[PDB]
């Protein structure tokens, strides 16, 4: 949600909304405006927790900027296929694998 916290790496309602309004208007508008596989559709394999319905779209965040490192990165924000922010995920204490949820997610 607005003012989302990914373990230690906090994100303002401004950060959440910046990266979200970005893929919202860059995922399926009439372009990609991303690296390659970010923005992109949410995989399927090892489907993590997110309310609403889906499909979803990922966007790996950063501590002040959208369109940054996607694997490595850890910290990511993920929206629904319109504009509804589903929630954020992060490799904060994953050992480069085990993803945990952000802002009340697990």
From Swiss-Prot:
Transmembrane segments: none
Domain of life: Eukaryota
Disulfide bonds: 6-102, 24-83
Keywords in alphabetical order: Disulfide bond, Endonuclease, Hydrolase, Lyase, Nuclease, Pyrrolidone carboxylic acid, Signal
Catalytic class of the enzyme: lyase
Enzyme Commission numbers on file: 4.6.1.24
GO molecular function: lyase activity; ribonuclease T1 activity; RNA binding; RNA endonuclease activity
Active-site residues per Swiss-Prot or TrEMBL entry: 40, 58 (proton acceptor), 91 (proton donor)
Catalytic activity line of the entry: [RNA] containing guanosine + H2O = an [RNA fragment]-3'-guanosine-3'-phosphate + a 5'-hydroxy-ribonucleotide-3'-[RNA fragment]
Keyword Signal: yes
Similarity annotation: Belongs to the ribonuclease N1/T1 family.
Name of the protein described by the UniProt record: Guanyl-specific ribonuclease F1
Organism of this sequence: Fusarium fujikuroi
Parent-record interval covered: 27 to 131 of 131
């Amino acid at each position: 949600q607005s003012a989302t916290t990914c373990g230690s790496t906090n994100y303002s309602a401004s950060q959440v909304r910046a990266a979200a309004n970005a893929a919202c208007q860059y995922y399926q508008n009439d372009d990609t405006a991303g690296s390659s596989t970010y923005p992109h559709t949410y995989n399927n394999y090892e489907g993590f927790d997110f309310p609403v319905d889906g499909p979803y779209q990922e966007f790996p965040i950063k501590s002040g900027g959208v369109y940054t490192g996607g694997s490595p990165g850890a910290d990511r924000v993920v929206i629904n296929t319109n504009c509804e922010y589903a929630g954020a995920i992060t490799h904060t204490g994953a050992s480069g694998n085990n993803f945990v949820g952000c802002s009340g997610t697990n």
